[PDB]
Protein backbone atom coordinates (compact mmCIF):
# COMPACT_ATOMS: atom_id res chain seq x y z
CA UNK A 1 0.00 0.00 0.00
CA UNK A 2 2.97 2.33 0.49
CA UNK A 3 4.01 1.83 -3.14
CA UNK A 4 0.62 1.63 -4.82
CA UNK A 5 -0.97 4.48 -2.86
CA UNK A 6 1.98 6.76 -3.60
CA UNK A 7 0.77 8.20 -6.91
CA UNK A 8 3.99 10.14 -7.53
CA UNK A 9 5.29 7.46 -9.93
CA UNK A 10 4.34 7.51 -13.60
CA UNK A 11 3.63 3.91 -14.61
CA UNK A 12 1.96 1.05 -12.69
CA UNK A 13 0.87 -1.78 -15.02
CA UNK A 14 0.99 -5.27 -13.55
CA UNK A 15 1.14 -8.56 -15.44
CA UNK A 16 -0.43 -11.80 -14.29
CA UNK A 17 -1.60 -10.16 -11.04
CA UNK A 18 -3.35 -6.99 -10.13
CA UNK A 19 -2.19 -3.94 -8.14
CA UNK A 20 -5.02 -3.25 -5.68
CA UNK A 21 -5.21 -6.78 -4.33
CA UNK A 22 -1.49 -7.56 -4.48
CA UNK A 23 -1.99 -7.30 -0.71
CA UNK A 24 -3.71 -10.68 -0.93
CA UNK A 25 -1.20 -13.18 -2.35
CA UNK A 26 1.72 -14.65 -0.40
CA UNK A 27 4.83 -14.92 -2.51
CA UNK A 28 7.69 -17.36 -2.94
CA UNK A 29 10.28 -14.80 -4.05
CA UNK A 30 10.36 -11.17 -5.14
CA UNK A 31 13.30 -9.66 -7.00
CA UNK A 32 13.79 -5.89 -7.06
CA UNK A 33 15.73 -4.63 -10.06
CA UNK A 34 16.56 -1.03 -10.96
CA UNK A 35 18.06 0.91 -13.84
CA UNK A 36 18.09 4.32 -15.53
CA UNK A 37 16.92 5.04 -19.09
CA UNK A 38 15.20 7.70 -21.13
CA UNK A 39 11.46 8.22 -20.76
CA UNK A 40 10.86 7.45 -24.43
CA UNK A 41 11.52 3.78 -23.79
CA UNK A 42 8.88 3.07 -21.17
CA UNK A 43 7.32 1.15 -24.04
CA UNK A 44 10.41 -1.06 -24.15
CA UNK A 45 9.66 -2.30 -20.64
CA UNK A 46 7.12 -4.60 -22.25
CA UNK A 47 6.70 -8.27 -23.19
CA UNK A 48 7.06 -8.50 -26.95
CA UNK A 49 8.60 -5.18 -27.97
CA UNK B 1 -8.90 -39.28 -18.01
CA UNK B 2 -11.82 -37.02 -17.17
CA UNK B 3 -10.52 -36.26 -13.68
CA UNK B 4 -6.93 -35.76 -14.77
CA UNK B 5 -8.00 -33.31 -17.47
CA UNK B 6 -8.65 -30.79 -14.70
CA UNK B 7 -4.89 -30.25 -14.30
CA UNK B 8 -4.13 -28.61 -17.65
CA UNK B 9 -3.68 -24.86 -18.01
CA UNK B 10 -5.61 -24.76 -21.31
CA UNK B 11 -3.75 -21.58 -22.21
CA UNK B 12 -4.72 -19.56 -19.15
CA UNK B 13 -2.49 -18.07 -16.47
CA UNK B 14 -2.81 -21.09 -14.19
CA UNK B 15 -4.83 -24.28 -13.96
CA UNK B 16 -6.25 -23.88 -10.45
CA UNK B 17 -9.40 -21.81 -10.70
CA UNK B 18 -9.28 -20.76 -7.03
CA UNK B 19 -6.05 -18.92 -7.86
CA UNK B 20 -7.14 -17.33 -11.13
CA UNK B 21 -10.16 -15.93 -9.30
CA UNK B 22 -8.06 -14.80 -6.35
CA UNK B 23 -5.21 -13.26 -8.37
CA UNK B 24 -6.44 -11.20 -11.35
CA UNK B 25 -8.96 -8.38 -11.29
CA UNK B 26 -12.50 -9.18 -12.49
CA UNK B 27 -12.31 -7.21 -15.79
CA UNK B 28 -9.13 -9.16 -16.47
CA UNK B 29 -10.47 -12.35 -14.87
CA UNK B 30 -13.19 -12.97 -17.45
CA UNK B 31 -10.56 -13.47 -20.14
CA UNK B 32 -8.46 -16.09 -18.38
CA UNK B 33 -11.57 -17.90 -17.19
CA UNK B 34 -12.96 -18.04 -20.73
CA UNK B 35 -10.46 -20.47 -22.23
CA UNK B 36 -10.63 -22.59 -19.09
CA UNK B 37 -14.41 -22.94 -19.35
CA UNK B 38 -14.31 -23.79 -23.04
CA UNK B 39 -11.58 -26.39 -22.56
CA UNK B 40 -13.31 -28.12 -19.68
CA UNK B 41 -16.62 -28.10 -21.55
CA UNK B 42 -15.08 -29.72 -24.61
CA UNK B 43 -13.52 -32.38 -22.38
CA UNK B 44 -16.85 -33.08 -20.71
CA UNK B 45 -18.61 -33.40 -24.06
CA UNK B 46 -16.03 -35.86 -25.35
CA UNK B 47 -16.51 -37.89 -22.19
CA UNK B 48 -20.27 -38.08 -22.50
CA UNK B 49 -20.10 -38.84 -26.22
CA UNK B 50 -17.95 -41.91 -25.59
Look at residue A42 and give its three-state secondary structure: helix
Task: Report residue A38 CA to chain centroid gap.
Answer: 17
Measured distance CA(A25)–CA(B22) in Å, rounded:
8
- Residues of B whose CB is below 8 A from A17: 23-24
Which one of B14, B21, B25 would you mutate to disrupt binding with A, by most A Cβ within 10 Å of its Cβ? B25
State the method.
Answer: cryo-EM
Contacts of B28 in chain A (CB under 8 A): 18
Query: Apex CA A48: angle with CA B23 and CA B28, to 5°?
Result: 25
Q: Helical H runs in B1-50? A: 17-23, 26-49
Per the CB < 8 A criterion, the answer to whether B39 and B6 are in contact is no
Amino acid sequence: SVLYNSASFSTFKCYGVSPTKLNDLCFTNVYADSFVIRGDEVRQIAPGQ
Amino acid sequence: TLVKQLSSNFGAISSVLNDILARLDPPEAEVQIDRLITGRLQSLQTYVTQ
